[PDB]
Design a protein around this nucleic acid. Structure first.
Ligand SMILES: *O=P([O])([O])OP([O])(=O)O[C][C]1O[C](N2[C]=[N+]([C])C3=C2N=C([N])[N]C3=O)[C]([O])[C]1[O]
Ligand SMILES: [Mg+2]
Ligand SMILES: [Mg+2]
Ligand SMILES: [Zn+2]
Ligand SMILES: [Zn+2]
Ligand SMILES: [Zn+2]
Lengths: 648, 650, 641
RNA sequence: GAAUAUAAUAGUGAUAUUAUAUUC
RNA sequence: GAAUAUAAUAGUGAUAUUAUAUUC
């Protein structure tokens, strides 16, 4: 073992007393030891004729592996069996026997959800203790709350079974969209209701010890000026008529370079695919043209945004890569036309990407900050957060594409090194290297994310700069810093309540939400037995019929018959995953000319090698009327759904 | 995930062809990744309708936990359920269910032996691949060899059950008591037959790669001398003569001080003084209890002489002092009160001699010389020091900490159940991997050739050194004949690898059969249990404890006592190291109650729902009521009285 | 196709730095030599010229290196020549050196040519290369050359000195007990060679390890035999000692008794008597007794280091070689003939056999059973053991697979010793040391006997002190390596300072060690024989040639000795062996020297180590081993005789 | 492939779009 | 013949004896 902190004992104390409790402690103060202590006490509290059974809930695989290894290494010596079940090792194994024959079971929540729904696990009465890692996710349709729905449904019912103690683990419970303290109080009470918690454990009598371990990094706010247009009066006309040669085909009833323009191009593109035409032959031409036009427009928009947030050079390289991929996917008259127009004006560019006269002031401010902090301390470890995955290697190539930052060794963390560039890590996650500097490049999320991000630099002297060219970001961070105060104050206020009163308010909210969920069930579909024709979305070619489509596990959708096999092509999948009882063998694209529109994937399901498609790649025409309707999700498309039968 | 050494592939190659293989490679080359590769390939080789089941055999708990951790972390992603069963998690669990429902199972061999004997595991046919760590232990009746006994007994018999592939992992197969080449070769063949192996995988093509990753440390031999003239030994010898005279007053004992022969002698005498009966039963209990004390004190004096022989005089002095303080804290006896005074009478001489710098152990001066001259050339040296007894561990820690010349050292302890130098008794096989030691000093310490080869793993870096400090020549002799034995081993293997695999399989087979029915004959005796009820006296005070009629046998191994009569014959102390073996749980240790005795009887455990005393015959002397003759027994299975199986009744 | 570690070893020397080079025996030092020399020669401008001298303590190494250097550098346009003792004289070396760019020498040549004054100074050269530079110490020729070098260096002269490169596998640590002593020893060795750099492989160690393999060493400590033979042959010399003690006024078998017999024998050579006729008799008896006791002792030794038959046959050879039996020798030969019948029934007895021979036979059997094409080399201390073990090999039925050869084709070569590495070696698989341990240097050099993988070495002995003597050599090697690695960290300036101070120190020691010449007593003295005390000649008749050799000008002496053909004639200096000198007395036959054909006249050269010197006045008898210890009126020989 | 979460944007909202991340 | 080196054994050592090897 190892000598623990006092605030750890303090945090684990309400849990060891057998009370369902939510533990709220700063990120990286060692919640793992708290879990181990709670589990140890809970397991070794039982008599000889009875035995306990603990279940742990990690939301992601790294935490799964880590916690499993630690728990197994620590508790085996005590004579307790520790195991784990994730999606990889969940198939073709009796999970009920795995649960029964073990004392500690580390799970991803989806496993327990699926097994409860299926029936392999009768009730939650099997466990004597449930622990939720990052219990702030216990809300809405998240698997955690899906479990707690079962828990409460058993609790709030005549059917009485020994329900397990519930422990939550987090650094922030959240406040929702609360404008004041009394609303945040209601939010926290609602969460405690969702977790059936009667206690909220925080550090109080040992704060002086805790604050010598986890240091809050100072948060500097860097508001910079925007660019002042070497890439604005060039792609403008390009966008103008690349929209209007699409208007050459038909008239269609909004500033450029924004997200609204993105939404506009998207909905327009999703409104062009339904242009019914008696010619049909040239309907394909029209749709395949307009699709290309819009697909070029939106990526032009992407280039504009990337330029607006990063180097203009990367804004070019983006489009160059795009047209490269377009030329690699087969040459079309339209595609080679737009490409010709692009490369005609490309000579004017590149040279513009080569002037220091037009350099993003944001990147110059970032260069200033980095140079300063690495001058004051060369052994600085910096972590950087960006909005999109496009800006990652953009800022990377910006770093090594600069002699001023020759002291930097960029690293990537998306789906040894001085600085690590990343998108956005979910929750605390597996602990990485400790950083002395945290930079937020136009990146601001929720309050919980803000509080959790402090774990990146919980050492003394750690700093955090928020670099942006927008005020809305700044205010969006300030409101979070206020929300934290609201949360802490609401919690400290709730900790003054009597346990019973709190319990009955919780029970009240629980009964309320239960009634809501019960009455929420509704007569949703009247299945249309009419056979519908599924066409392609790009070239409008006939893909299949609804009569040929089979549904697997009430989630996935395949196509039968040898007719469809001559309608698609396939290339080996880039990231061959393994989901459920499936296995991604390859990808599936259209076959009509070199359309090559993505239709779905080709999988190996048991002893079958079958195509699985997504409805958001097809247009649902009616064989009778002709009304071409669109569906973004399969569950939105209600038709005669026939379960997949191996008899075929 | 990445960059496997080519010699690793070379070693895993025969095992990736289904061939039962013994792998022989230097310690530290990375046998774990070899295991991972063999196991992985073994798992991906099975089609869709079939599945494999690999089992890993670890001899020690740290190795168990480590391997379970690695295998779990590596094969979880692929989709293989990895689990483990040790002695701590073996009770009240469905082993059949745990074994089936998992793809990879890490076990301590005793678990499999027990569960096979119990019948919970029908046959080894459930497995498709068995891996043995430190497979050179597959000999005599070590658990590995028992498992392989079951394997062979299923193989050679009429049983046609599909047996799993067998892989062994070692750095040295050993040669045994071989004196030449074709003896070592026959030994190795016997071991391969014990493991059903037909291939011995070693590095041959990728030697140049291996010899740059695992370096053979340079060895050295330091032959010195003990103390020229010892005054400590004289005083202790005269004390010994005094005590021996005090003991000779009662009986006439029908050799040299400070030797092991005298230890054996005083053990035999102490044993023979506990079968001296008297009709008074109060003169018996007063004479035997005194003789026990005398022999014990003589023994402690001997241990002190050995300690002083190997270390400082202060170490032996503190040893004796701690002994006398311990028996003084136990409660002064009438036959021991004089001994402490006799010792304190010469304590002034001993203490004044233990401080005199001129008569100091020259072995320690040579060791200090080595340490000094080695840390002077490299101050960041990490040293590891091997000694025989733990008394020497403590002694050398106190010596290092208590010496101005070695004020640069920070000694640590590593015995049985940061820092510059690490002092340790011995490590079974390779063991868990600790920090590299570019200096391995052996202080009067030699073992088998296997340990000699495995110890080189401690310093597998370039320039790493190894010393053998001793005052005895037989030590060095043993080391060099060990090296010659290593030559014999390597050459025997190198010659076996040139043979025909079919021919080798034939030999293996006809060694296996021969052994199989040499195990058949004899081995079936059944000494008739005499039903006569015998008394059980305390070996120290000769007082009555219980009868053989009150003694019940639990699980054919342990032994308890019944009645509320035995209860008033003992007291108990909270056990210093409580454990949980099998279906038991140590709660306390049990001692006698007759006044100044307090002799070790047994322990107090919680078996199932019962709180019971478990005793050892090693601490009791048996007295036949009929004949009146007293007999001494050490092991319970040597006392063939009538076994009375344990039952929840009574 | 040069190796990288070779270039690495040559790198410091190619920077004009005086460098000692350490690298395992047989890693291609010749290539490094050629590289360094090549770079040294092509460095000079047009107006200047380069001149390199390569030393060699062995004629075979001399001819190998001369051949290689000549074949290599002839193309580039450099004249390569060599000088040895066979072609050292009747030639102007002064001009030979001047007319060449590369000169390969045996060091004694340059020493003698510097002493004679034929060569002014070492300024003539620009680069000197010492092969086996670990010999640069004491009174060795290398150290003499370096004495000249240092004398010109530290001296007031400012003449240009040549760059000094040394080649070795081990610099040695002398008798160092710790790292400091080893370190300073290595430092004074550097000062002896005026070195500032010690080049070892460090960057390309992996390559060197991939080329040269360290053979695995084993030690075999057996016990000594059982010995009736011991006592049986002992009472012979107890009886002999009894006989010798009857005319004049401890453990048998070991060296103490040997040098005891030696010193006593030398003490009987000075036992005088007025008769000078009974004197010769009693001292010839006292001579025969000791000279026989010695052979008996040595027989007792060979008995232990071999089989009893070897020692027996040795004695039977001695007694039959000393015959061509005298009246005094008749008793010894009769008492020995009365020893043969009881000795040989045990000397043929299979019961009493040497444990060392048993274990050796076992080792050979094993290693040849494993590999039938094994090449074995066996080192022994004496030649008696050479022939004895050859006879034992060809005599033992079990070893009928061996083809023993001699080194003082074949399956196993039996050898005494090889000074340093030597030339081309039969690369063996098995090296065996039969009661043979030298120093650390010769050990590391012995590693070169098997630089191939799988090669093995054995140390067969009964004495533990031998094993200890080897282990301490290993520890000494460790100390050497460590001290070198520590020296390679010092800055060159500080090192040069230390070296300079050591040089001035040692030079001061030498200059203050030189004692003046003793006063030669011109008074005459009678030089007479030691075996029979017979008057050989007087000092006035004796004349000295080349201040080294000594002859006699007198026909009276010419009739006082006999001449018999040399066992192995050879040529030295300006001389030429042909015969050998013995005492002309009937039953004496004692070695006096040799007769040679020096230049024109044939003259007899004698040794003082076979003559005892009495005084014409006092008559005091004295012994002298070397002519350097015997000071007198040294009258220079010259042709008119 | 499907589900879930977070952020921004349009909207009165149920929602929708995109971005990002996770899980089965 | 002379010179020189290495090892062993005596000696506090300077040295000496012996063995082995080399060289002019
Ligand atoms: O595409 P899958 O059906 O196999 O499922 P998945 O996990 O990748 O979903 C990711 C989504 O992003 C799009 N996608 C998938 N791939 C392989 C690519 C892309 N988009 C780009 N630009 N390049 C790719 O290689 C899919 O639409 C999917 O829904
Ligand atoms: Mg699914
Ligand atoms: Mg001469
Ligand atoms: Zn299409
Ligand atoms: Zn008792
Ligand atoms: Zn004579």
């Amino acid at each position: 073992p190892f000598k623990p902190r006092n605030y750890q004992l303090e945090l684990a104390l309400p849990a060891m007393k057998g009370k369902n409790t939510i533990i709220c402690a700063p990120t990286g103060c060692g919640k793992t030891f708290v879990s181990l202590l709670i589990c140890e006490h809970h397991l070794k509290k039982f008599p000889q004729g009875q035995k306990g059974k603990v279940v742990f809930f990690a939301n992601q695989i790294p935490v799964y592996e880590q916690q499993k290894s630690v728990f197994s290494k620590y508790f085996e010596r005590h004579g307790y069996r520790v195991t784990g079940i994730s999606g990889a090792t969940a198939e073709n194994v009796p999970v009920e026997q795995i649960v029964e024959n073990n004392d500690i079971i580390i799970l991803t929540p989806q496993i327990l959800v699926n097994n409860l729904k299926k029936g392999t696990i009768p009730s939650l009465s099997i466990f004597t203790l449930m622990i939720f890692d990052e219990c702030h996710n216990t809300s809405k349709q998240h698997p955690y709350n899906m479990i707690m729905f079962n828990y409460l449904d058993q609790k709030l019912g005549g059917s009485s079974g020994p329900l397990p103690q519930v422990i939550g683990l987090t650094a922030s419970v959240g406040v929702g969209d609360a404008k004041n303290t009394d609303e945040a109080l209601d939010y926290i009470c609602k969460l405690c209701a969702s977790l059936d918690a009667s206690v909220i454990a925080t550090v109080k009598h040992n704060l002086e010890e805790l604050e010598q371990v986890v240091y809050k990094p100072q948060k500097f706010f860097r508001k910079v000026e925007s660019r002042i247009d070497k890439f604005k009066y060039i792609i403008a006309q390009l966008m103008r008529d690349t929209e209007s040669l699409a208007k050459r085909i038909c008239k269609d009833l909004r500033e450029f370079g924004t997200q609204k323009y993105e939404q506009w191009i998207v909905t327009v593109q999703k409104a062009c695919m339904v242009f019914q035409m008696p010619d049909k032959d040239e309907e394909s031409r029209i749709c395949k043209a307009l699709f290309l036009y819009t697909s070029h427009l939106r990526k032009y928009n992407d280039a504009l945004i990337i330029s607006e947030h990063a180097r203009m050079k990367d804004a070019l390289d983006y489009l160059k890569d795009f047209f490269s991929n377009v030329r690699a996917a087969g040459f079309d008259e339209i595609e080679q036309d737009l490409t010709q127009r692009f490369e005609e004006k490309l000579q004017e560019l590149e040279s513009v990407s080569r002037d220091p006269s037009n350099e993003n002031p944001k990147l110059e401010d970032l260069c200033f900050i980095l140079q300063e902090e690495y001058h004051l301390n060369p052994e600085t470890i910096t972590i950087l957060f960006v909005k999109t995955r496009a800006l990652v290697d953009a800022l990377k190539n910006w770093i090594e594409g600069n002699p001023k930052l020759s002291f930097l060794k960029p690293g990537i963390l998306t789906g040894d090194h001085n600085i690590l560039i990343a998108t956005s890590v979910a929750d605390e996650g597996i602990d990485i290297a400790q950083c002395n500097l945290v930079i937020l490049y136009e990146y601001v999320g929720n309050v919980i994310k803000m509080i959790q991000t402090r774990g990146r630099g919980r050492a003394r002297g750690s700093k955090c700069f928020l670099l942006t060219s927008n005020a809305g970001v700044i205010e969006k961070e300030q409101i979070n810093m206020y929300k934290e105060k609201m949360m802490n104050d609401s919690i400290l206020r709730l900790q003054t309540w009597d346990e019973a009163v709190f319990r009955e308010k919780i029970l009240h909210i629980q009964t309320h939400e239960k009634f809501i969920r019960d009455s929420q069930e509704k007569p949703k579909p009247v299945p249309d037995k009419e056979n519908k024709k599924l066409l392609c979305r790009k070239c409008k070619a006939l893909a299949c019929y609804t009569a040929d489509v089979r549904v697997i596990e009430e989630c996935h959708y395949t196509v039968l018959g040898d007719a469809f096999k001559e309608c698609f092509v396939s290339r080996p999948h880039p990231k061959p995953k393994q989901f459920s009882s499936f296995e991604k063998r390859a990808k599936i694209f259209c076959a009509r000319q070199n359309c090559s529109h993505d239709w779905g994937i080709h999988v190996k399901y048991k002893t079958f090698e079958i195509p699985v498609i997504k409805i958001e790649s097809f247009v649902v025409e009616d064989i009778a009327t002709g009304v071409q309707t669109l569906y973004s999700k399969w569950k939105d498309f209600h038709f005669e759904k026939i379960p997949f039968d191996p008899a075929e």
